[PDB]
């Protein structure tokens, strides 16, 4: 099985681009990261920052996770992100996503040793 840290990287990191420049970015990335393999993952966010900068969020502002857990951290600065969400007309295996680029603070859940991001909670 994939570790939790590795799964976060695979689902959320896209350091190769500064931001989504096409409306088709989500359709391509969701497929390339195998997020449409068995089904269409409904929502997913990609972060366009270095891995080191995202990992550093685990030493930033400690906040509560939506679930009530307290191992969430909010980035001090905003980051370039792309939200990917299935449109009303999406049906596996013909997954279709709307791409929305923005600059926001990210909130992630951290765990382990080393203490790294294991889940993407939200953006603000
Ligand atoms: Cl790992
Ligand atoms: Cl994979
Ligand atoms: Cl997400």
Swiss-Prot record:
GO cellular component: extracellular region
GO terms, molecular function: lyase activity; nucleic acid binding; ribonuclease A activity; RNA nuclease activity
Tissue: Pancreas.
Subcellular location as annotated: Secreted
Record-level GO BP terms: defense response to Gram-positive bacterium
Sugar attachment sites: 1, 7, 34, 37, 41
Enzyme Commission number(s) from the entry: 4.6.1.18
Catalyzed chemical reaction(s): an [RNA] containing cytidine + H2O = an [RNA]-3'-cytidine-3'-phosphate + a 5'-hydroxy-ribonucleotide-3'-[RNA]; an [RNA] containing uridine + H2O = an [RNA]-3'-uridine-3'-phosphate + a 5'-hydroxy-ribonucleotide-3'-[RNA]
UniProt feature coiled coil, ranges: none
Active site: 12 (proton acceptor), 119 (proton donor)
List of residues binding substrate: 7, 10, 41-45, 66, 85
Disulfide bonds: 26-84, 40-95, 58-110, 65-72
Record family assignment: Belongs to the pancreatic ribonuclease family.
Subunit structure as annotated in this protein's UniProt entry: Interacts with and forms tight 1:1 complexes with RNH1. Dimerization of two such complexes may occur. Interaction with RNH1 inhibits this protein. Monomer.
Role this protein plays: Endonuclease that catalyzes the cleavage of RNA on the 3' side of pyrimidine nucleotides. Acts on single-stranded and double-stranded RNA.
This protein's name: Ribonuclease pancreatic
């Amino acid at each position: 099985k994939e570790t939790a840290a590795a799964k976060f990287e695979r689902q959320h990191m896209d350091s190769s681009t500064s931001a989504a420049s096409s409306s088709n970015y989500c359709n391509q990335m969701m497929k390339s990261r195998n997020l449409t393999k068995d089904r269409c993952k409904p929502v997913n966010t990609f972060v366009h920052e270095s891995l080191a900068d995202v990992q550093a969020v685990c030493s930033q502002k400690n906040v509560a996770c939506k679930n009530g857990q307290t191992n969430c951290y909010q980035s001090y600065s905003t980051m370039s992100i792309t939200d990917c969400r299935e449109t009303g007309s999406s049906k596996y295996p013909n997954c279709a996503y709307k791409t929305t680029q923005a600059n926001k603070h990210i909130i992630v859940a951290c765990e382990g040793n080393p203490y790294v991001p294991v889940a993407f909670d939200a953006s603000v």
